């Protein structure tokens, strides 16, 4: 045997492993490695646009700390 079904299932699991984590990795690689922002409502989109405008490099994920206000 009954365990001879275990190999194929394992391979299938490996395939189902591929998308999820990959997406996560892609998101990180595209957003400075910090869990790409979710904008469900207009307020969150406005926050993202404000960050993009004040970043100075046209990237919303480049956050500015207290060192940017003298």
């Amino acid at each position: 045997m009954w365990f001879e079904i275990l190999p194929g299932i394992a391979v299938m699991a490996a395939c189902l492993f591929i998308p999820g984590m990959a997406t996560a990795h892609i998101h990180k690689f595209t957003n400075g490695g910090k869990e790409k922002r979710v904008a469900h409502f207009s307020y969150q989109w406005n926050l993202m646009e404000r960050d993009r405008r004040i970043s100075g490099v046209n990237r919303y994920h480049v956050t500015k700390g207290l060192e940017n206000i003298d």
Binding site: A39, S42, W45, N46, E49, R50
Partner: protein
Amino acid sequence: LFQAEKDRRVLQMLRENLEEEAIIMKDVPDWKVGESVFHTTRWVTPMMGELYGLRTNEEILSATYGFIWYT
């Protein structure tokens, strides 16, 4: 703070558009620059065709379809 910044940004965009319209409309014989289309004299919120009217296509796309297309 966001409200204050939004008001200042909208006013700056409107002023830039008005200055540019004054520049362009100079040779038009019967044009009054900055003329309102409403009989009233109170404040009317811009239409987004008045803010990003003279700007590029990418800015317009981000302004109008930016939020809806973000997934």
